[PDB]
Amino acid sequence: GIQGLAKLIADVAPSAIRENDIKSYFGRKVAIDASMSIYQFLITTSHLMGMFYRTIRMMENGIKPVYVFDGKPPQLKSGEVKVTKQHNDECKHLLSLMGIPYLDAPSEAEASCAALVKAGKVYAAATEDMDCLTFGSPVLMRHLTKLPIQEFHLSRILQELGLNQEQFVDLCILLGSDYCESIRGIGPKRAVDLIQKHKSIEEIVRRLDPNKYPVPENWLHKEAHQLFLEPEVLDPESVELKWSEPNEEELIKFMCGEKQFSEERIRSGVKRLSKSRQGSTLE
Numbered sequence: 001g002i003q004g005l006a007k008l009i010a011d012v013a014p015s016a017i018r019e020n021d022i023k024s025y026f027g028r029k030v031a032i033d034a035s036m037s038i039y040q041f042l043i044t045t046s047h048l049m050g051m052f053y054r055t056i057r058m059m060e061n062g063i064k065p066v067y068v069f070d071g072k073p074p075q076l077k078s079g080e081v082k083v084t085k086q087h088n089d090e091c092k093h094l095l096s097l098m099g100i101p102y103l104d105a106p107s108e109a110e111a112s113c114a115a116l117v118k119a120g121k122v123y124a125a126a127t128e129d130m131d132c133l134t135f136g137s138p139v140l141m142r143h144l145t146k147l148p149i150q151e152f153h154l155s156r157i158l159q160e161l162g163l164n165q166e167q168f169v170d171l172c173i174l175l176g177s178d179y180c181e182s183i184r185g186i187g188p189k190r191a192v193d194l195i196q197k198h199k200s201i202e203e204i205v206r207r208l209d210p211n212k213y214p215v216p217e218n219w220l221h222k223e224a225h226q227l228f229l230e231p232e233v234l235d236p237e238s239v240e241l242k243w244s245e246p247n248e249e250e251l252i253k254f255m256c257g258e259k260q261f262s263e264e265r266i267r268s269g270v271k272r273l274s275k276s277r278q279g280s281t282l283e
Ligand SMILES: O=c1c2sccc2n(C[C@H]2COc3ccccc3O2)c(=O)n1O
Pocket: 001, 002, 035, 036, 039, 070, 083, 108, 109, 110, 128, 129, 130, 131, 178
């Protein structure tokens, strides 16, 4: 998470956010940040029927989802609802039975998501996690999750604010990332100006007096910067995405044989999923 990036873009780079209806993304592959999507659904097997029904709704609306699951968290995190290892396990299990593709990301899903968008194997990466942009994703989608879908274009953010990726990462770090602390008393809108004018954090600290503006003690901003820039990702060229026919009788055995769901209610969910797979990927 980047503390307050969404509000920043809307204010000083609005030309990057284009608000669209779920219907205009017909026949479109999107990479779905599974951890962030489960976070949404947890608002109890709530995570599983969230993913069951929402994926059907996406598939009926033309969208072809591909979920990407978090792996091992990177060393640096100690600078800053709870998505567990079972939440992930059960969801993966479910998607497997629906014929939806999932991907086990080496580290953080929104980096691997971004990578699919870079390599151009999806249209966009669906997530509210704003640091997916910082991971270099050309297009981010918000609220795919009543509420409009906000499309973010990274080339426009960089174009308006007049910064390359590297500088942009440092802006994000100054806004407040998951990896390190920011410079206290530096507002987000003042952070922009200092990035535009002085380009990088190491420099900004130089033109800042140690008394008035102290940084974190042994501040790992450089390490954060390395992570956002060179993150551990999967190779999308090697990775293959396929949408299979759902295994219905096995899907019952799981949601109803293990997870106390309504059999005929799942039955119809699977039949809509199957029907839309014939609309989306008849092939
Ligand atoms: O997968 C996640 C998850 S799951 C729960 C939280 C996170 N975060 C931290 C931030 C990401 O952005 C957020 C946006 C909205 C609400 C919580 C957020 O939490 C993340 O950065 N990633 O990558």
